[PDB]
Design a protein around this ligand. Structure first.
Ligand SMILES: Nc1nc2c(ncn2[C@@H]2O[C@H](COP(=O)(O)OP(=O)(O)OP(=O)(O)O)[C@@H](O)[C@H]2O)c(=O)[nH]1
Lengths: 551, 503, 226, 392
């Protein structure tokens, strides 16, 4: 089982040295090459852009050239996905860029320079982009520059506000927003001058800090909740009394506009954390580690998972379906993982199948600079944004099944693993599913796995796989499952009855003996002993009849 | 009701609903003994059975000594079994296929005009296997003599379909596709939304659970007569749900094709169908039985096993009406689902299809449904086969949504005929791979082919038919046809079309 | 012709003009050996018909004289064929090198009887005949006097050479050397032996040079007589 | 992979010959007599009835029967991979036609004496073995004349035609190996059974400086002993003259050949490296091409080569086998709504790829490097054919 992808790089640079026989990677052209025409014929047949047009109202080829130069002249501070096919970049020196796309393809480039003279021209550190305002942090001043919108940056109001904080020492400040205006939080690693997180109100009088806190440990990252908009979630780096690394997880709530910690959780690490990611259902925390350990924790359970990435997983991007996690690296390497942290093989499009455990971008396009950002293009969602320092920009496209209607959920991973008979992996997903939240998916995933296995000749390995699959319902780590047992018990017990009959036919005896006890059927015990009459193995003997009378 | 239709040998064939034209065309089936008794005065001592009795078969019967001579003599020369021969009779070419088991020989002969040799080879394998499914080893079917009156019916249907396909526009489509699809190692399967798969799997699983409270041992002081092994459900000729092993699904479908039960369901509303037989499956008490119940376009097949959790059986028992009632009741509960399954047939559950006639003459979903690349849909037809799970995907009533004019209808025929030739190479590759796998316990060969395709021109346009074989641990066969204007990669189409596909 | 002249260093240099990579260079019908610019060679050409019963090695004999591969399968010759063989020789009388172009005409035994015109076709200009007999077949040996009187016929001024074949199959010899000597006592023939063996490109040269020089001696000498 | 060919007089049941090969290498092994009697007896059993037996096959091998006129039954058994009924049926037409060239129809049909054929049909063995064995020519399989594109469209044809006047025959051609470089219009109008066998008869033989073989003409005069003359003026290169009783070969003196061919010696020398490769050395072939087969369907001629990329595997012998097997496949499917192109991709892994296209009257097949993109197969063959169109 593997994912099949193709990569589109939105650049005109010849420096990428992409092989011309490689159909998996695409580049834009201006007005080594021996197979380039064949690749072009395919690209044109598919209606991909090749040579970009310059049209009077929209000089796409030339506007792209300026964008490439912007990336080289100054670092990008921010990239944001406004819509599934629309995005904006913000650059140092205040230049804003807006791109519009069709599928993986770029359609227009807009460069907006109106903001350039409006700024204090201190170094930005971080930023928040606008539906109605832009907020800029600075390294060297305790100010937020605030730009209010009502070239398209023409209807501008410019102001800035003082921020309570430490003396400026080139502070690595960061910003986050919950819902544009509703909440802003500013924070930095390290009473007001000792505090390192600020809850900012949004008012007609400008931005103000409503309250401030000092965390016990420097944050690795900060997020706002989607289901809990007034919660600020942090992951913080901490050290145990045994001097071992831990990932703290803390929830801070705004109560009467006062930000305070409400809950603390701790996860032991094999090495110090280097990255943080939260999943789309907001019930799992994924932490990258310096030693390339990947650690996952489920908030509703005491369950954690471990895996070894090859890549030193400095950046993590979770797919919005929650089914796929990607591990990026500053080294330009990408690796794909299951929610269960089972490795998934990956391939770029080619005439023959040849999956790899990891993808090295350096192998395909000779990128000259470090990878900075990965994002899934959440405003189906088969596009992953890639940005390198000083360019190139581009999008990685994932091929998704037609028969699944483009969906890539956990149910679909069960179907895909069963398609390849990767049963243990399918089981690990089934154990990753929550029966109390995903009952429909749990019944379908189990049914696929059990129906797959009962069609097979029995082997000792398969006896364990069948038992484990039913064990995910019968032997939960969570006793609170009793809340939903009445919904699932019927279809699961029907599978258990099938397992009993399947194992009896192979004269295993002991498993069928115990399954009848867990099933509790009145007559099923009667098949036990009946077989014994022709085998001599009368383990249950007459007891089958007493049990039938008691049930 | 159906109880009166039960035969003395336990067989039941109950049905309730809501060949002169072939005799100008030479054809024959024969079963011969290879053990000569030249001392016998008896004529035609070699023939244990033949069909039809006609002018059409008499000419082939008169030359039967040729088949016997070649079967033993060529085998003695090459060390291998004879598989076919080709003759001209009355100026017309005829192909004859051979199958030899246990010193007996089965022969089938059909005209070349209607039946290409590779179709004939698949048909003799299909006949020998279906006869084995119904009777066990071939002698059990033929040498009994008394079975002749029903063997004649089996062969009568076989020949009628082979010589006059679709004579027994959707019906013409089925005739066009039958040449390829009926010989696949799988069954036509309909792709469904997971919501329908879960409802069907849950209802179907009740039979395997066998929760027969009304038949419990403590109520009758009796062991239940059969253990249910599994079952599979078809709607309107399409398999929709199965809990049964792949090999059993294929043998059962072959039975249903030979009695035309599935294509009959495709055209007519059947009030009731009940079939019961002893069967002889590939596995390895050793007694197994097949029960088929049909209703309102649904056909449900169940295999029952003697012994195991169940009581032993001897002789030739009739159908157990209790098991029949359980199957019928289960099938009746799916009536409320019928509007949803029909909706899936009315829509394209697969990729979007375009009509060939157009070329000579919500949106997120429609782009997700494009198997081919580009803004335009160049796909006309495809067959996708999962060789591991025994299921394949084709266009349905979508073909009627396509105009079906002089361009489109000819192009469907060209697709299936070309794909039959493509399979010949794939079958040769697969047999060689199995042989090598056993031999482990060649350069310039054309045989180990992964892809083949042909482009055609047409008029009232270029029409491209391509197929691919996958030899990896997950073997697959894929056939696609598309317009020449868009280039395609078989890997991308195979990934998109097979991804997420499981029974 | 000087015996074993080709074994001398000067002889080695002339063999080199017909060899490449120690292998025979076959020549086309109008192709010629290329001499060094300082070298002038007198070129002579002869028309030789190869005759005898089927299975006597006539095709094999020419291939050995040509240095061409000798066939193992007894395909019958179906018609008139010509092989052209180039071979240098030093003359004992003139001390000059003369190079020969031998035409080996070989109709085939069956072809001569089926097609009446073929025999005269092979005789349009012929000035020599080769008469083969096998060492393993007495009948071809005993029929030889007839072949000598009937194929050559009455014609004056004609070279006739008898060659034994299949000597290497010694265990199967039907005709002892005593009988061949008795034959030569009545006929005074220039008898030669060929072993038509199917190692390397020069191996054929070492064995065939003896017969080519003997053939050269009669053809060259009789040309000086004419 | 053994191959056996049997021939029997149909009426006597007496084998006239058996020929064999293994792996394309000729062999002396013959079938057991009781087997041979059953192979012919079964055919004649069908002949006592109206029903003809044309073919049979086994899991590993195939067998084909043909009945020619009233007198000949040919049976072929082959274990070779890539064997098909069409391939064997065309081969038996070539075997029969070879028998016609050597003894004629007048002798071969209406047979009065099986013994006469026993001695006279041995003459056909060398040519028959060539059809059963490995060869660099495809004319037997395609029924097209094997051809090579000349260095000039002018001087070769003009000299050849003037020579034809000098020789007194309308039928003259120049071929290298089995490949025709140029031919006169008389030579070109010969029907397939004759036009293909004639160069095969010449190219299958051990090399000779000159030849005069009896040929009974498959067309016009099958009863008359016409003669085929050839002159191998340069190694690997010879003229063919299709002649009546004149000229004699002895009259075709070196001075005549020097006058007509010395002026072309340079382009004739060039024709020798040309022999192995049908195209001009400057022809813009794609680097992925391992070999080429081009047929002109109306003009009954084709080009063949495995030369264009010598550095890659397969070996040249192996490349020819893939093209012959592919042509055989094309011949039964794409060739007799209207097929215009075909292609193959072989395994294991990155195996070799093959393509074919038809544009109007001409059809091209290619053997390609395993690394060549599969989506480019049609566009490559189309461009190559268009580049070839001016040449054939
Ligand atoms: N061992 C051995 N075999 C020989 C020799 N000469 C000929 N043969 C065999 O004799 C057979 C026929 O030889 P040919 O050269 O064809 O005799 P031919 O005189 O040319 O026969 P025609 O073509 O009918 O005239 C072959 O099978 C050869 O192997 C020889 O010197 N030694």
């Amino acid at each position: 089982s593997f994912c099949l992808t193709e990569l589109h790089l939105w650049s005109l640079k010849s420096t990428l040295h992409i092989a011309d026989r490689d159909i998996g990677v695409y580049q834009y052209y201006d007005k080594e090459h021996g197979n380039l025409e064949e690749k072009q014929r395919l690209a044109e047949s598919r209606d991909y852009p090749w040579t970009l047009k310059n049209r009077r109202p929209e000089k796409l080829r030339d506007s792209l050239k300026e964008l490439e130069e912007l990336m080289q002249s100054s670092p990008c501070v921010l990239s944001k996905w406004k819509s599934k096919y629309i995005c904006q970049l913000l650059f140092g020196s205040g230049v804003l860029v807006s791109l519009s796309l069709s599928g993986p393809q770029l359609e227009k480039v807009v460069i907006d320079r109106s903001l350039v003279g409006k700024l204090i021209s201190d170094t930005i550190s971080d930023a928040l982009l606008t539906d109605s305002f832009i907020i800029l942090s600075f390294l060297a001043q305790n100010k937020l520059c605030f730009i209010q919108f009502t070239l398209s940056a023409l209807d501008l109001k410019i102001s800035y506000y003082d921020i309570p904080g430490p003396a400026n020492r080139t502070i690595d400040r960061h910003l986050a927003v919950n819902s544009t205006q509703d909440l802003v939080v500013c924070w930095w690693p390290l009473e007001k001058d000792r505090a390192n997180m600020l809850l900012l109100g949004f008012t007609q009088g400008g931005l103000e800090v409503l309250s401030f806190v000092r965390t016990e440990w420097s944050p690795l990252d900060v997020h706002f909740g989607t289901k809990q908009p007034y919660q600020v979630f942090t992951v913080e780096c901490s050290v145990s009394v045994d001097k071992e690394p831990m990932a703290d997880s803390c929830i801070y709530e705004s109560v009467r506009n006062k930000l305070h910690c409400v809950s603390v959780t701790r996860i032991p690490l094999r090495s110090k954390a280097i990255s943080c990611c939260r999943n789309s259902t907001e019930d799992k925390l994924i932490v990258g580690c310096e030693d390339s350990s990947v650690i996952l924790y489920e908030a509703h359970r005491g369950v954690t998972l471990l895996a070894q990435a090859e890549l030193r997983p400095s950046l993590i991007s979770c797919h919005p379906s929650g089914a796929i996690l990607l591990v990026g690296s500053n080294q330009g390497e990408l690796q794909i993982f299951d929610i269960a942290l089972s490795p998934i093989n990956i391939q770029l499009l080619a005439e023959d199948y040849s999956p790899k455990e990891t993808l090295q971008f350096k192998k395909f396009f000779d990128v000259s600079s470090s990878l900075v950002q990965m994002q899934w293009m959440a405003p189906i969602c088969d596009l992953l944004f890639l940005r390198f320092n000083k360019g190139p920009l581009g999008v990685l496209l994932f091929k998704l099944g037609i028969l699944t209607r483009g969906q890539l959920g956990l149910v679909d991973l069960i179907l895909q693993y069963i398609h390849y008979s990767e049963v243990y992996e399918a089981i690990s997903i089934l154990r990753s599913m929550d029966w109390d939240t995903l009952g429909q998916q749990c019944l379908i995933g189990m049914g696929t796995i059990v129906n797959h296995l009962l069609r097979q000749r029995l082997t000792p390995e398969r006896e364990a796989q069948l038992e484990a699959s039913l064990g995910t319902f019968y032997a939960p780590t969570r006793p609170l499952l009793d809340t939903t047992i009445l919904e699932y018990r019927e279809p699961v017990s029907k599978y258990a009855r099938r397992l009993f009959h399947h194992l009896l036919r192979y004269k295993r005896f002991e498993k069928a003996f115990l399954l009848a006890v867990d099933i509790g059927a009145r007559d099923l015990f009667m098949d036990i002993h009946y077989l014994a009459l022709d085998m001599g193995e009368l383990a249950l003997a007459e007891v089958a009849r007493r049990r039938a009378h008691d049930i | 009701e159906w109880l009166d239709s039960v035969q003395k040998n336990g067989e039941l064939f109950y049905l309730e609903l809501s060949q002169h034209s072939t005799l100008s065309i030479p054809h024959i089936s024969m079963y011969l003994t290879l053990q000569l008794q030249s001392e016998a005065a008896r004529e035609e001592q070699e023939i244990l059975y033949h069909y039809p009795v006609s002018e059409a078969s008499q000419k082939l019967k008169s030359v039967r000594g040729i088949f016997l001579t070649l079967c033993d003599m060529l085998e003695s020369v090459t060390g291998t079994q004879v598989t076919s021969s080709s003759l001209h009779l009355n100026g017309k070419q005829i192909h004859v296929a051979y199958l030899k088991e246990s010193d007996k020989l089965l022969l089938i002969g059909l005209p070349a005009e209607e039946v290409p040799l590779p179709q004939l080879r698949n048909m003799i394998e299909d006949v020998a296997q279906t006869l084995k499914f119904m009777y066990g080893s071939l002698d059990s079917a033929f040498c009994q003599v008394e079975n002749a009156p029903r063997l004649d019916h089996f062969f009568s249907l076989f020949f009628e379909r082979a010589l006059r396909p679709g004579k027994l526009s959707a019906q013409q489509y089925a005739a066009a596709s039958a040449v390829l699809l009926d010989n696949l190692p799988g069954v036509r399967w309909l792709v469904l939304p997971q919501e329908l798969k879960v409802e069907l799997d849950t209802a179907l699983s009740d039979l395997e659970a066998a929760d027969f409270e009304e038949l419990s041992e403590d109520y009758y002081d009796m062991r239940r007569l059969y253990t249910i092994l599994g079952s599979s459900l078809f709607y309107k000729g399409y398999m929709v749900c199965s809990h049964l092993p792949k090999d059993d699904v294929i043998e059962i479908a072959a039975y249903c094709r030979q009695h035309c039960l599935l294509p009959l369901a495709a055209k007519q509303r059947i009030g009731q169908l009940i079939i019961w037989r002893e069967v002889f499956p590939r596995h390895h008490e050793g007694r197994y039985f097949l029960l088929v119940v049909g209703l309102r376009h649904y056909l449900l097949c169940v295999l029952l096993e003697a012994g195991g959790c169940a009581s032993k059986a001897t002789g030739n028992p009739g159908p157990d009406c209790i098991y029949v009632d359980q199957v019928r009741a289960t099938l009746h509960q799916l009536e409320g689902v019928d509007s949803r399954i029909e909706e899936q047939l009315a829509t394209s559950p697969g990729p979007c299809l375009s009509c060939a006639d157009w070329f000579l003459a919500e949106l997120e979903v429609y782009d997700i449904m494009k198997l081919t690349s580009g803004p335009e849909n160049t796909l006309f037809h495809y067959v996708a086969l999962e060789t591991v799970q025994g299921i394949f995907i084709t266009p349905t009533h979508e073909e009627v949504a396509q105009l079906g004019g002089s361009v489109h209808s000819q192009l469907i025929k060209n697709f299936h005929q070309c794909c039959l030739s493509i399979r010949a190479f794939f079958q040769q590759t697969l047999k060689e791979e199995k042989k090598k796998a056993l031999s482990d316990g060649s350069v310039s060969s054309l045989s180990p082919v992964k892809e083949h395709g042909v482009l055609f021109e047409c008029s009232p346009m270029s029409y491209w038919v391509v197929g691919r074989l996958f030899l990896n641990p997950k073997p697959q066969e894929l056939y696609v046809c598309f317009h020449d204007s868009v280039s395609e990669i078989a890997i991308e189409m195979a990934f998109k079309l097979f991804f997420g596909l499981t029974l | 012709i000087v015996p074993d002249w080709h074994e001398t260093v000067e002889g080695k240099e002339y063999l080199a003009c017909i060899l490449r990579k120690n292998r025979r260079r076959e020549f086309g019908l109008l192709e010629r050996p290329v001499l060094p610019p300082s070298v002038v060679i007198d070129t002579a050409s002869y028309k030789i018909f190869v005759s005898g019963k089927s299975g006597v090695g006539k095709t094999a004999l020419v291939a050995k004289l040509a240095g061409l591969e000798v066939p193992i399968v007894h395909h019958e010759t179906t018609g008139i064929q010509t092989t052209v063989v180039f071979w240098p020789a030093k003359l004992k009388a003139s001390d000059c090198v003369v190079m020969f172009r031998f035409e080996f005409w070989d109709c085939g035994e069956s072809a001569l009887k089926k097609f009446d015109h073929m025999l005269p076709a092979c005789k349009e200009n012929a000035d020599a005949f080769l008469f083969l007999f096998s060492f393993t077949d007495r009948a071809s040996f005993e029929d030889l006097p007839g072949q000598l009187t009937r194929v050559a016929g009455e014609a004056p001024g004609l070279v006739k050479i008898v060659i034994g074949s299949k000597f290497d199959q010694y265990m199967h010899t039907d005709v002892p050397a005593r009988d061949l000597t008795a034959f030569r006592q009545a006929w005074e023939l220039p008898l030669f032996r060929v072993k038509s063996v199917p190692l390397d490109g020069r191996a054929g040269l070492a064995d065939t040079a003896h017969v080519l020089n003997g053939l050269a001696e009669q053809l060259w000498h009789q040309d000086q007589v004419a | 992979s053994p191959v056996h060919l049997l021939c029997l007089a149909a009426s006597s049941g007496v084998p006239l010959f058996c020929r064999s090969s293994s792996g394309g290498a000729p062999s002396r092994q013959q079938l057991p007599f009781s087997v041979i009697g059953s192979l012919n007896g079964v055919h004649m059993f069908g002949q006592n009835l109206d029903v003809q037996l044309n073919s049979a096959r086994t899991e590993d091998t195939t067998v084909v029967w043909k009945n020619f006129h009233d007198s000949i039954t040919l049976i072929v058994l082959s274990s070779e991979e890539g064997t098909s009924e069409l391939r064997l049926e065309r081969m038996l037409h070539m075997v029969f036609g070879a028998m016609v060239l050597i003894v004629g129809l007048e002798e071969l049909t209406n047979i009065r004496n099986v013994e006469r054929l026993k001695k006279e049909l041995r003459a056909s063995y060398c040519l028959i073995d060539s059809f059963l064995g490995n060869s660099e020519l495809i004319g037997d399989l395609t029924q097209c004349v094997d051809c090579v594109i000349p260095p000039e469209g002018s001087a070769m044809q003009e000299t050849l035609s003037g020579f034809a006047e000098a020789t007194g025959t309308a039928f003259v051609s120049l071929l290298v190996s089995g490949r025709v470089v140029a031919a006169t219009e008389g030579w070109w109008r010969l029907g397939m059974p004759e036009a293909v066998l004639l160069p095969w008869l010449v190219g299958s033989l051990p090399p000779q400086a000159a030849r005069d073989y009896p040929v009974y003409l498959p067309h016009g005069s099958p009863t008359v002993p016409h003669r085929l003359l050839t002159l191998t003026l340069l190694r690997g290169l010879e003229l063919c003259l299709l002649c009546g009783p004149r000229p004699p070969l002895g009259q075709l003196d070196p001075q005549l050949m020097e006058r007509w061919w010395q002026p072309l010696l340079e382009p004739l020398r060039a024709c020798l490296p040309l022999g192995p490769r049908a195209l001009p050395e400057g022809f813009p072939l794609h680097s992925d091409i391992l070999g080429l087969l081009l047929l002109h369907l109306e003009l009954r001629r084709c080009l063949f080569t495995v030369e264009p990329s010598k550095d890659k595997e397969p070996s040249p012998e192996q490349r020819r086998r893939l093209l012959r097997n592919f042509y055989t496949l094309v011949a039964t499917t794409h060739f007799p709504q209207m097929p215009r192109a075909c292609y193959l991709v072989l395994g294991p892994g990155m195996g070799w790829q093959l393509v074919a296209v038809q544009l109007g009257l001409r059809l091209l097949l290619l053997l390609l490097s395993p690394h060549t993109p599969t989506h480019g197969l049609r566009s490559l063959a189309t461009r190559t054919l268009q580049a070839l169109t001016p040449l054939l």
